[PDB]
Every structure is written in structure tokens, then in C-alpha cells.
């Protein structure tokens, strides 16, 4: 896991386009009308992790292997969702434990553009200040009426919760990790996608895009579901299913 066949090159608001296919676990969650409303990450051939607040149902579709949502030349896999596992301890008023698992009705075919991000162990430590990356098809500018066709990426630093509470205070829970406030911001349509840090050569899912500035201000951090605090539930869900 976590080693893209097409290597990402790093030089969402004030991000940049991804090298096409360089983030092969990134999936697009699209409704009946083909409308992208959220992102997600492949954790293996049959399971996607995403945000609980995205509200995914079996009427929605997991689209894998996309780069340009306005191009019709990419071999994309349009995968039905067999079951939705929204974390029962997701508190919608607090946006805490903001995670949902999607069990695919049929398996994704892994390829150079479709593969899995690594999951961390509940005890890995991702130090405040590590440079990590987040990706998505969310807005590139807060007032935009449509989302970019091409997958975007941004490098950004993690924040200790304590420093993050200076921005957001008691809204910050332990099942949250903060990142950014450094000239970039995730934005509408990025929810559900990955925040990844590169552990021992492999990219490892450290956060799930969760919430932030109503205006995607680049001077206040984004908040992510802290994968470290929820990966045991993830592994036990898969074990039982």
C-alpha cells in the first residue's frame, strides 16, 4: 500500500494539479446524476473510507482512477456500494468521529492508477509540524460555482491539537487532527478525501478531510478526522464484514 505506481511530484485553495494518477487511492463519491459531492480513499480492493457527514448511501457511486472529471479518456471504475458503515459515534453537532466505511459490491481492479493508501496503527505518532499532503476536487476558490475537473493537491503542516485550539477552541476533539493554516485550505467538495503523510517511504492516511472555515481561509487550519483514533474500529469493521 501507499506506494503510487506514478510518483507524486509536489512543488483546495492555492493548491496545484496532481501529476495525473499520482494519488491512486483517491476516489470520487458521485450521486445518481454523476455529481461529485465528496472524496474518499481506497484502503483495499473492497473498502473505501470517507467522512460520515458526507451522507453516503447505496444510491451513490464510488468512481476510481479519475484525474480529469471533464475528460472521457481515463479508464475509470464506476463501483456500486453494497453497504454503508457510518460510525455510530459520529456526533453530527460536534463533527467528531467523522468517518464512514464503504463496502464495494464488486472489487476495484488495482492498476497503475488505482490502488490502496496505507492505514496507520492506533499508536503511530505523527508529530506536529510534519509536512503532509491533502488532495481532492473541492473548490479552488471560495466563491466558485463549480468544482475543478482535475485532481488538486497541497502540501501543508500538521498542528498539535493544543495549537489548533488557539484557532478553534473547544470545537476541537481528540478524534480530530488539524493541518494547514499555511497559505492553503481544503474547501467545499474535499470532505471525505485523504490527508496523507509519508511513513518509511509509504504514504499513510493520517486524516480525513472534515471541516473548516466557511470561507476556506488560508490562514486558519483545516480539521480532519484523526485516523489514528479510529483505525481500530476500521480494522474491526472489516474483520466482521
Amino acid at each position: 500500500c501507499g506506494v503510487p505506481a506514478i510518483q507524486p511530484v509536489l512543488s483546495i485553495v492555492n493548491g496545484e494539479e496532481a501529476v495525473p494518477g499520482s494519488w491512486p487511492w483517491q476516489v470520487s463519491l458521485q450521486d445518481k446524476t454523476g455529481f461529485h459531492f465528496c472524496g474518499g480513499s481506497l484502503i483495499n480492493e473492497n473498502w473505501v473510507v470517507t467522512a460520515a457527514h458526507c451522507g453516503v448511501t447505496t444510491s451513490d457511486v464510488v468512481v476510481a482512477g479519475e484525474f480529469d472529471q471533464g475528460s472521457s479518456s481515463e479508464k475509470i471504475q464506476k463501483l456500486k456500494i453494497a453497504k454503508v458503515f457510518k460510525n455510530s459515534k459520529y456526533n453530527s453537532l460536534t463533527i467528531n468521529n467523522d468517518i464512514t466505511l464503504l463496502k464495494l459490491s464488486t472489487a476495484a481492479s488495482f492498476s497503475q492508477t488505482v490502488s490502496a493508501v496505507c492505514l496507520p496503527s492506533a499508536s503511530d505518532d505523527f508529530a506536529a509540524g510534519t509536512t503532509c499532503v491533502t488532495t481532492g476536487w473541492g473548490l479552488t476558490r471560495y466563491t466558485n460555482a463549480n468544482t475543478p475537473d482535475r485532481l488538486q493537491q497541497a502540501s501543508l503542516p500538521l498542528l498539535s491539537n493544543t495549537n489548533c485550539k488557539k484557532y478553534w477552541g473547544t470545537k476541537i476533539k481528540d478524534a480530530m487532527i488539524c493541518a494547514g493554516a499555511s497559505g492553503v485550505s481544503s474547501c467545499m467538495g474535499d470532505s471525505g478525501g485523504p490527508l496523507v503523510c509519508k511513513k518509511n517511504g509509504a504514504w499513510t492516511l493520517v486524516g480525513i478531510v472534515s471541516w473548516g472555515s466557511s470561507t476556506c481561509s488560508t490562514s486558519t487550519p483545516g480539521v480532519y478526522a484523526r485516523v489514528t483514533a479510529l483505525v481500530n474500529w476500521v480494522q474491526q469493521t472489516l474483520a466482521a464484514n
Binding site: H36, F37, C38, A51, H53, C54, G55, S92, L93, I95, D98, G138, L139, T147, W168, K171, S186, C187, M188, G189, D190, S191, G192, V209, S210, W211, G212, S213, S214, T215, C216, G222
Partner: protein, 64 residues
């Protein structure tokens, strides 16, 4: 500006946030607005004003 649904912490003045969720953005009066970055965004006011605001849904208890 209104709020159907506040909740308050152990002070008096009780620190009452409004819990109401609005799609896309918060009403004009809110001074700090967060959103779950789905599309459409799911947006909340984290302000501390009140004491709870005006209810939004009309009153319905005068005719009889």
C-alpha cells in the same frame, strides 16, 4: 437572524452556541462560521451571543 436550537454551558451568562445547521453558509449575522466541506457544505455558527436567539420556526399558540 434567529436560532431554533441553542445549547448552553455551565456559566451564567450561559455560553449558548446555536446548533442549527445551514447548507452552504451561515446567516449574515454570524461572526465565525465553520462548515463540513462536503458539497453542499454543512455550515454552523460557532459564535457566542446569547442566551439563545429568536426561534426561526413561527410561534403557533395564540388563535385558541
Amino acid at each position: 437572524p434567529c436560532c431554533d436550537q441553542c445549547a448552553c454551558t455551565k456559566s451564567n451568562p450561559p455560553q449558548c452556541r446555536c446548533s442549527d445547521m445551514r447548507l452552504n453558509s451561515c446567516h449574515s449575522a454570524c461572526k465565525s462560521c465553520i462548515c463540513a466541506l462536503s458539497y453542499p457544505a454543512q455550515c454552523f455558527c460557532v459564535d457566542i451571543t446569547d442566551f439563545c436567539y429568536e426561534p426561526c420556526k413561527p410561534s403557533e399558540d395564540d388563535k385558541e
